[PDB]
Amino acid sequence: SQVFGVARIYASFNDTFVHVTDLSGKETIARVTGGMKVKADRDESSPYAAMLAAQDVAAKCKEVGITAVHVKIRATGGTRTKTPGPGGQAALRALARSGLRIGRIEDVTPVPSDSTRKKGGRRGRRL
Amino acid sequence: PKKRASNGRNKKGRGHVKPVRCVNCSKSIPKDKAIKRMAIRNIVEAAAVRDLSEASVYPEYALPKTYNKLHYCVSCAIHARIVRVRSREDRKNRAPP
Amino acid sequence: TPVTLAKVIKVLGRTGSRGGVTQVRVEFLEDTSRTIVRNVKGPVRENDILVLMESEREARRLR
Amino acid sequence: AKRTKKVGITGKYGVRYGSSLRRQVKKLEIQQHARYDCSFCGKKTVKRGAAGIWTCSCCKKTVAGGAYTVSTAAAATVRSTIRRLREMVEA
Amino acid sequence: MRAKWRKKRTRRLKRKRRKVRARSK
Amino acid sequence: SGRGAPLAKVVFRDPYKYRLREEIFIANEGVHTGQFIYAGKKASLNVGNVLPLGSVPEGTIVSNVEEKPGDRGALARASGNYVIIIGHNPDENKTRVRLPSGAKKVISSDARGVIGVIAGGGRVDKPLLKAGRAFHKYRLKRNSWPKTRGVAMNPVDHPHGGGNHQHIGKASTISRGAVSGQKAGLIAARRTGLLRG
Amino acid sequence: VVDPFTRKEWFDIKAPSTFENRNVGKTLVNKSTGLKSASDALKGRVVEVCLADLQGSEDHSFRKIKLRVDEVQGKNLLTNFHGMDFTTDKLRSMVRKWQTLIEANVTVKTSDDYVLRIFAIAFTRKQANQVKRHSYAQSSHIRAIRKVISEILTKEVQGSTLAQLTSKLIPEVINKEIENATKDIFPLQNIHVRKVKLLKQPKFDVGALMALHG
RNA sequence: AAAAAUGAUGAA
RNA sequence: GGUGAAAUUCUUGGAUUUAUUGAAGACUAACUACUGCGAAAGCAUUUGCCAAGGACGUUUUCAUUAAUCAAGAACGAAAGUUAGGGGAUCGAAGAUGAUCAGAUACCGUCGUAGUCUUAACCAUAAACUAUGCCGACUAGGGAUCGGGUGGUGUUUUUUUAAUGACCCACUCGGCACCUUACGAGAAAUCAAAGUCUUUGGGUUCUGGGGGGAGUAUGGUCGCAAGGCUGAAACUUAAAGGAAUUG
């Protein structure tokens, strides 16, 4: 009784992608990032930016016909942090509170079973 | 002088282990020495739990968790307050709390 | 209408480097079951009513 | 008695062409003039006629091989790979 | 100065000494 | 003479007339005198056998490969060279292979090749050490040795000739569209200098 | 300049008969144009579905399913089995410390020419009344368990059609029989197939697809 | 995880 | 994208992001431990082949065949060297954007050699337990790995009736750990670093205040880088260890 999409939230540091697609995933509806909700260049990964992006994405999911959405949360992954950025939870909650129905949340961060050498050098990034 | 009977690590019997990389700075640290934490968290924050349970299409959803094993070097663990410098006798305690 | 009335049901503590901001928990007046945590500038009591220009941002910088 | 300390067979070249080139040539000429085991008759009688041609002094069998060795590592690897592919095709 | 840098700069100096003495010889 | 790779004399029976037919194969390494060679669509996958590209599996090492079926061998003929089979396209009746230069090629699966690698490999690893051996090498091939540098000539003789010092004097990279008499140096070079620094 | 969603049809997606309720969801492509038709852009699509939704039960909350569109007829996309996998939360919740992790892996082809890779996962179990801290296995038990798991998996596949494999994956009979076969070697906790991937496909043979959709 | 260099000689 | 903040870069020729494929090289996460194996360096995907090894069991066999070792020999992280293959990633050098008084530093973006492999070299590390090896004895305790013994112990298809896992009690061997030091030590600490002025179980190697200096020179090994061996003149009253208070 509801039409489902897939939200495909990518919550890194430095940015947050909110990207709804069909079930197949190859048709995209309302990909909005925090970097085009804020103009600060450092607040691009903020929860406020993520919430504004998710509100826009829900607005465009409506009047296109998406009523419910499955959720694929993701971090940068690979050899990088694979900890979700600040904006993932704010985008999730904005999607849930902006009229969209929700189902089947899952974490799809790319995790290596083993990997190329990580960036930074042997002694790491020295601050 | 020698600060620690187990110099800074857990390696008695082998000699070489393998490096891991620090999650914060990517410093190479032997696995036996690295400070290791298991981050098991609900995939949805506690303040958003009610909102997502009300917005769910499933009457009885399970609210999955995320599992992530973090490896810290000594400097990053101390800077991030994961471990703290301890008094001379308190250093000998190995219990987690 | 972008004006939200929320009532302070609990004062959490002081925040800010200089201690000028206060963590509070407020419940909405339109519905008395939706509580949020906000950062407040001046002196606050329990049962004080705040005016929320926006009403979705959770308060950061906790203690 | 030991007549040369290191030049070996390249002592025919005297002092010319450079010691590195003489060392490379020494390695490959020792390989090229060695006697090799015959895979057919089991004797140590296989010598090079010309590059790639290896003939056993007895049983007179000739096998195509490497320029300076009877078998190259590539040819052995190819033989093993072809055997494996043959085995899966036949089974 | 750090010991490994004493060693490194001394090694460079020994290279220069060998070079000038080979020049003489 | 003039060839690094040894040759195998392989004699077959004539299917249609009572007589023998001698063929001149490029010997693959490990092939011996007195060995039975099988050629055809139903030949077994053994070193020295001649098979169509379609009938052999992925990763097969072949040599003397036909670009077109029936041209009797065009690819991977020099000593130590081979072709790697890297895939099939049964609907198109094509086989994808890797050539010795690294190029990827698509050939009809009816083209034949010899299982194995051309014999005589490792030949260019040994230095010639002296002009006399290069002389004997090229007197069995053709008159392309020795080579006089263009900058050692006069302007009448070569584009690089002349000058009060030996020097090219203009870029030695020459366009593909240049005419005969101009194409000396590096023709249509996409890049110059030492590869990967 | 132009709204791109005025040229969409919202094709419906149908699951094979080897599942509970057939209606999976919805998808959209484009208006069929004389240059490019919707069918080509709509075939080959992989739709990711939770087996809980395919079966109408929450005990299949993990172990998601991939459905591959094989052809379009009318406004219905008839899918077929394309893969199975566990959810990340399930895998990470099962992989805990102080127990041995046993993984097995086979590649086998069904009765029809569906060559596919089957995985399998199991963990060592503490006995009731066990006082020892960890319950690790002795690396010969692991090899014996892996051998018997491989034979069981190779035996249930290549003796079945892809449909029969799916219809025996849903009730989880392979992991129960793995437990029965391994119970004399070492006790185990979480025996699962965890993943099925398909490597090569046979000819289209649309008759079998229509046998699964009817 | 912004920046922060230096401090003449002897002197119960 | 990236950062503390940026910029260098990419981007309506569609970047980033989504999907379906493919190729390549490298790695072997989670499980993973005060756990295992190896002479050390080291060694973590599956399966097959090849030889090897410790411990245990042994009313098997030989009978001193042993311990430590100048000379001598094999192996020996990383980097580095020669030549071929490979060359995804990261990344000395280099190039660039920042920061800065400067900043060819830290931070950012690239990027050569290198990183991987085959065949040869090199022979060095805080190559560390900064504790040579062999042997004997001296204190309480609980775990753990491998082997063995016992229990009329539990548990699994049939509920002692076709045999693993677990439990209990011992034992040999091992990685260790906790408490305490009767003892030792300058102390830190140590179960050996004890059995040392009540000084002797056997044996090898090394040191003799700090610098000059692991330098010069000679020899020798190495393709080289360099390794090994290795002074003197001269100079100087401390340098150094472990703790205490600030």
CA of F85 to C1' of I113 (A): 34
Q: Which of B54, D54, G174 is nearest to F30 (CA)?
A: D54
Give me B74's structure tokens.
């000594």
Cα separation, G196 vs G117, whole angstroms? 6
C interface test, pick of A45, A51, A92 with most C CB neighbours within 10 Å: A51
Q: Which domain holds residue C5?
A: 1-63
Chain F residue with CA closest to D86: the answer is: F45
Domains of chain A (ranges, CATH numbers)? 1-127 (3.30.420.80)
Contact, A127 CB vs strand H, < 7 Å: yes
Burial call G26-58: b when 16+ CB within 10 Å, e when fewer = bbbbeeeeeeeebeeebeebebbbbbbbbbeee
Residue nearest to nucleotide I224 (CA to C1'): E15
Q: Are F40 and F32 in contact (CB under 8 A)?
A: no
The interface residues of chain A toward chain G in range 9-28, judged by CB-CB distance below 8 A, are 22-27
Phi–psi pair at A17, nearest 5 degrees: -105, 130
Tell me if residue F149 falls in helix, strand or coil. coil
**Chain B residues with CB inside 8 Å of A81's CB?**
23
Cα separation, B51 vs B65, whole angstroms? 17
Q: Are D89 and F45 in contact (CB under 8 A)?
A: yes
CA of G193 to C1' of I232 (A): 79
Segment (H or E) for A93: helix A87-97
Under an 8 A CB cutoff, do D67 and F122 touch?
yes
CA F154 to chain centroid: 36
Within an 8 Å CB–CB cutoff, is residue D58 touching chain F? no
Cα separation, G135 vs G101, whole angstroms? 11
For G56-68, what is the HEC assignment? CCHHHCCCEEEEE
Q: State the CATH number of the domain containing residue C5.
A: 2.40.50.140
Residue with the two structure tokens 């052809």: G71
A interface test, pick of G10, G13, G23, G28 with most A CB neighbours within 10 Å: G28
CA of G137 to C1' of I59 (A): 37
CA of A79 to C1' of I8 (A): 24
Q: Where are the alpha helices (DSSP H) in F102-172?
A: 131-139
CA of G161 to C1' of I48 (A): 30
Cα separation, A42 vs A14, whole angstroms? 7
Distance from CA of A98 to the nearest CA of G (A): 22
Q: What are the strands, taking DSSP E only, across chain F?
A: 7-13, 20-26, 50-52, 61-63, 83-89, 94-98, 104-108, 112-115, 173-174, 186-187
The bases of strand I with some atom under 7 A from any protein CB are 1-7, 16-21, 24-38, 40-48, 82-83, 86-93, 106-109, 111-113, 118, 129-131, 143-147, 153-157, 163-168, 175-179, 187-190, 193, 213-217, 225-226, 241-243
- Domain-wise residue ranges, chain G: 6-214
Contact, B21 CB vs strand H, < 7 Å: no
- For chain F, helix (H) and strand (E) counts, in that order, are 1, 10
Tell me if residue C50 falls in helix, strand or coil. strand
Tell me if residue G117 falls in helix, strand or coil. strand
Q: Where are the alpha helices (DSSP H) in G135-204?
A: 141-156, 162-169, 174-182
Enumerate residues 6+ apart whose C-beta is below 8 A from F178: F187
Enumerate residues 6+ apart whose C-beta is below 8 A from F132: none
**Chain C residues with CB inside 8 Å of A51's CB?**
56-57
Task: Domain count for chain C, please give it.
Answer: 1
Cα separation, D17 vs F68, whole angstroms? 46
Which residues share a beta bridge with G47?
G67
Cα separation, F89 vs F106, whole angstroms? 9
Contact, B82 CB vs strand H, < 7 Å: no
Distance from CA of C36 to the nearest CA of B (A): 8
CA F99 to chain centroid: 9
Within an 8 Å CB–CB cutoff, is residue B42 touching chain A? no
Q: Are D9 and D31 in contact (CB under 8 A)?
A: no
Strand F94-98 to strand F104-108: parallel, antiparallel, or no bridges (unpaired)? Answer: antiparallel
Enumerate residues 6+ apart whose C-beta is below 8 A from F93: F54, F108, F109, F110
Q: Which of G1, G29, G27, G30 is nearest to G13 (CA)?
A: G27
